T-cell receptor, first 123, second 106 residues
Framework: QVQLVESGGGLVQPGGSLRLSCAASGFTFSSYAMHWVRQAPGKGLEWVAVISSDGGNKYYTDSVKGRFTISRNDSKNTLYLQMNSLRTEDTAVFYCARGNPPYSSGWGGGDYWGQGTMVTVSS | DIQMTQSPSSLSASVGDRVTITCRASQDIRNDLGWYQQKPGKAPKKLIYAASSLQSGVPSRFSGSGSGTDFTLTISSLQPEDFATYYC????????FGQGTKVDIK
C-alpha cells in the first residue's frame, strides 16, 4: 500500500539551514509528481513546492523563492526540501503529498500525504 | 494563484444536523476542487475530488456539488466522528486553499 514518511524536522535558530526528507514506498515513485505543503500553528494549509517526475520541472510560492530547493532521487525513492535562511515565519509542520500520475493535469493528485515533521525556527 | 474564500469559518452543531460548507473562487476553476477533513494532530484526508466524486472508503453522507466559482460541501447527518476542520483545495493551477471551517460540538 502507498505510504509516505517525512523526517529531518527539528529545532533550528533563525537563519540556519535545514533539510527535509520524504521517504516513499508502495507505488511507482518514478512516475509521480511530488509536493510539499505546510501549516503554521493555528493556521491553515499552504502549498510550498512541486517537482515533476523526472525532476525536470520545479515550482515554488513567491514566499520561498531563492531560499528553498526541491529535489528527488528516483533511485532511493526519496523527495527532499533544502531550506536556507530560515525565518521565524516558517515555523510549521511540513507534509509531502503524492502529485499527479502520467498523462493527467500537472496540478492533479493530492490523495496521499505523510504524517509530517515540524520545523520550529526559534532561539 | 486564485483566491479561494471559504465560509462559515466555524459553526456549532449537534449530532444529526445537516451541515453545509461552501467555497467560492476569484475566477473559474471549473470542477478541479477537492474537500479535505483534518482532525486535531493528524494530516488531512481527501473526502471528495473533481467537485463531486466520492473518495474510496468515505460515507455517502458526504456529497459535494458546484462548478465554476461556487462550490459546496454537504453533510446529511452529522456524526460523532465528523467533528474536525474542513478545507477546500483549488487544483486548476498553483495549489491554493480555503481558510477553513471547523465544526464543533453544540
Amino acid at each position: 500500500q502507498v505510504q509516505l514518511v517525512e523526517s529531518g524536522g527539528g529545532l533550528v535558530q533563525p537563519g540556519g539551514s535545514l533539510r527535509l526528507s520524504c521517504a516513499a514506498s508502495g507505488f511507482t515513485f518514478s512516475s509521480y509528481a511530488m509536493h510539499w505543503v505546510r501549516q503554521a500553528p493555528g493556521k491553515g494549509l499552504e502549498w510550498v513546492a512541486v517537482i515533476s517526475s523526472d525532476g525536470g520541472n520545479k515550482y515554488y510560492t513567491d514566499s520561498v523563492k531563492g531560499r528553498f530547493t526541491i529535489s528527488r532521487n528516483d533511485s532511493k525513492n526519496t523527495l527532499y526540501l533544502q531550506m536556507n535562511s530560515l525565518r521565524t515565519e516558517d515555523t510549521a509542520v511540513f507534509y509531502c503529498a503524492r502529485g499527479n500520475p502520467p498523462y493527467s493535469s500537472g496540478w492533479g493528485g493530492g490523495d496521499y500525504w505523510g504524517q509530517g515533521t515540524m520545523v520550529t525556527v526559534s532561539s | 494563484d486564485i483566491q479561494m474564500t471559504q465560509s462559515p469559518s466555524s459553526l456549532s452543531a449537534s449530532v444529526g444536523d445537516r451541515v453545509t460548507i461552501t467555497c467560492r473562487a476569484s475566477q473559474d476553476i471549473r470542477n478541479d476542487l477537492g474537500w479535505y477533513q483534518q482532525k486535531p494532530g493528524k494530516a488531512p484526508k481527501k473526502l471528495i475530488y473533481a467537485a463531486s466524486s466520492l473518495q474510496s472508503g468515505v460515507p455517502s453522507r458526504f456529497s459535494g456539488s458546484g462548478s465554476g466559482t461556487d462550490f459546496t460541501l454537504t453533510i446529511s447527518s452529522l456524526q460523532p466522528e465528523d467533528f474536525a476542520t474542513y478545507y477546500c483545495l483549488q487544483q486548476n493551477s498553483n495549489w491554493t486553499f480555503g481558510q477553513g471551517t471547523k465544526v464543533d460540538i453544540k
